[PDB]
Structures are given as C-alpha cells and as structure tokens.
DNA sequence: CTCTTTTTTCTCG
DNA sequence: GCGAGAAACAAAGA
C-alpha cells in the first residue's frame, strides 16, 4: 500500500480495535516481528488498544500509554478482522486475538515488519528513517521543497520515492502526481521551474488528500481491511499503458525508470 | 523449464 | 556521498 490505503486501514482499525484488549497473540511466522515476537507477546498481551496513528506509509498501534507497535505493510500486507473461530488462510502471519474477534495480519511477499518501540522512542525512530513531512498545506512547505529541488541533480520520481521530500508516495501516485503536474519522470529536478514545482507541491497533496477520501486504489478489492477502496477508478496513467490520455488523447507509455514501471503521457509530459 | 513483473535497504565500484 | 542493481519473498503471466 501507499499513504492513502495506510490511512484507510488506519481509519477503519480506529472505528473498530480502540478500546480492546488483547487476549493473546500468535505467530506463524515471527521473524517479521524485528524487535522480536517472544518479547512483544510479553509485553503486549492483557493491554489495551488506545489508539492507532500514522507517519508516511506506516501505520502505528498505540497500545497501553508506553508501547507503539510500529507496522509497515511494504508491498502486499493486508490486515483483515475476523472471528475467533476463521479458519487460517496460506499467508496469514500474526494475530492479536480479543474477546470478540482477531485482528490478522497476512503477506504474500513476506516483506512486512512489526517493531515495537517506546511512546518516546516514536519521533526518534523516524528522525532515523530520515521520512519528509507528511503531505498537507500545513506540513508540506513549499519553499523548503524548491531548494531542495534545487540543489539536486536526481531525476524526480527515484526522488520522490524516496520519501525525504515528502512521505506516503509510491509507484501508484508518484505517476498519477506527475501525470497531473504535466512532468517528466526523469526529469532532473534542478531543471524544475517555480511554477512547475508549485503545481507539483499542490497535486502531490490534491491526488493524496483525494485517494483518502475514496479510500485509497483497490485493483484487487477482497476480504480485507481497506478493501473497498474506489481511487483506482480515478487512476489517469497507472497501469493505463496502450489507454489514451484523457487531457490530450496521445497513448499511455511504459517505460522503467530507476528499476520501476513508469506510466506517462509523452504529449503532456515533455521529456 | 527461463525470464519478467508486482517498499525499503543493502552492497558494490 | 553517488547510481545501478540486488536482496528480502511469492506467485502469475509470457
Ligand atoms: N524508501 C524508499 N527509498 C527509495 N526508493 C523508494 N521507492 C519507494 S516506493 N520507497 C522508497
Ligand atoms: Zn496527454
């Protein structure tokens, strides 16, 4: 998932876990549990779910005031809430099990990780990573992304995956934001005018703040948390290869960039 | 059978 | 420090 389909399963998990207790928790596969599965089932079992945030594409259990499980769902991760007796489906890892239902987590890819850190070990923890601001008006600023722009010789789209100028893009909306903002993407962001980078700033935030209030891209749209997602049907470039583009008519192209599927408008977006 | 395709963090030169 | 490519892993399609 990207920023917006975390922020989906962090809504519906926060209508739905707040308030539990965990009865216990299991693992068929404990080695994605990197601070170590025995000692977080210690220390989180009989402990209340209080809350559950978010920082780019990482999602954040506040569980009792001094435990943050921090969970990223890398390519394929999928939470789902079932009951005690739900049979166990192939790629199902870990569950938290409460009074009344399971929370389980599953991933075809094993790429997924669960850490589990101190309430003030969070911001710390992510001043490691080195993740940029959060992508809204009030955090994202403009000025400070310009100069980094402009210092740089990196072609834009490796650079705004890397989650430094802005957290919570992936290979979905990197194109999509890049589509709208009418750039190439290998284009050397120091080669970046103003206006160009003013319109890139705001549809970076437009496309992301409108993929939450659709709940994010569902392309397989089953048995899950997140699932009924409807931005996929707003996608303009992704995935569209061979498709006309609805601003000019000219044919989606596919080409990789930096080792990833790059989908663009070659009329609207000039080399 | 082989090769390619689908977030983060490493090695290598 | 940099870019290129690989590694973690599983499965589907050409
Ligand atoms: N964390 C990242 N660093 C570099 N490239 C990336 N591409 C995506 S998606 N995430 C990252
Ligand atoms: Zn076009």
Same mark, same amino acid.
């Given at each position: ?74 390519? &394929?991760?999928? =939470? ?7 049979? $166990? *489906? %192939?790629?199902?890892?870990? @569950?938290? /099990? ?35 601001? &959060?992508?809204? =008006? ?7 992304? $310009? *100069? %980094?722009?402009?210092?740089? @010789?990196? /072609? ?56 939450? /209030? ?56 000039? /080399?």
């Amino acid at each position: 998932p990207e920023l917006p389909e975390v922020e989906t399963v962090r809504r519906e998990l926060e209508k739905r876990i707040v308030g539990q207790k965990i009865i216990s928790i299991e693992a068929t596969y404990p080695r994605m549990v990197l601070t170590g599965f025995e000692q977080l089932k210690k220390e989180l079992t009989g402990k209340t779910i209080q809350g559950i945030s978010r920082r780019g594409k990482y999602l954040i259990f506040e569980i009792g005031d001094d435990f943050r499980l921090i969970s990223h769902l890398r390519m &394929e991760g999928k =939470y789902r809430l079932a009951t005690l007796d739900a049979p $166990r *489906e %192939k790629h199902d890892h870990l @569950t938290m /099990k409460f009074a009344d239902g399971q929370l389980i987590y599953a991933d075809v890819r094993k790429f997924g990780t669960w850490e589990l850190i101190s309430t003030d070990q969070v911001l710390p923890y992510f001043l490691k990573k080195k993740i940029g601001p &959060e992508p809204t =008006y009030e955090d994202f600023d403009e000025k400070l992304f $310009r *100069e %980094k722009l402009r210092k740089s @010789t990196k /072609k834009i789209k490796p650079y705004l995956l890397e989650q430094t100028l802005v957290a919570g893009l992936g290979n979905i909306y990197v194109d999509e934001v890049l589509w709208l903002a009418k750039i190439h993407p290998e284009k050397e962001t120091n080669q970046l005018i103003e206006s160009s980078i003013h319109l890139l700033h705001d549809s970076i935030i437009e496309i992301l703040q409108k993929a939450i /209030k659709l709940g994010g891209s569902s392309i397989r749209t089953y048995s899950a948390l997140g699932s009924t997602g409807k931005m996929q049907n707003e996608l303009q470039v992704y995935g569209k290869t061979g498709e006309k583009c609805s601003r000019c008519g000219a044919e989606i192209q596919k080409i990789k960039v930096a080792g990833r599927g790059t989908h663009f408008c070659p009329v609207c977006q000039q /080399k």
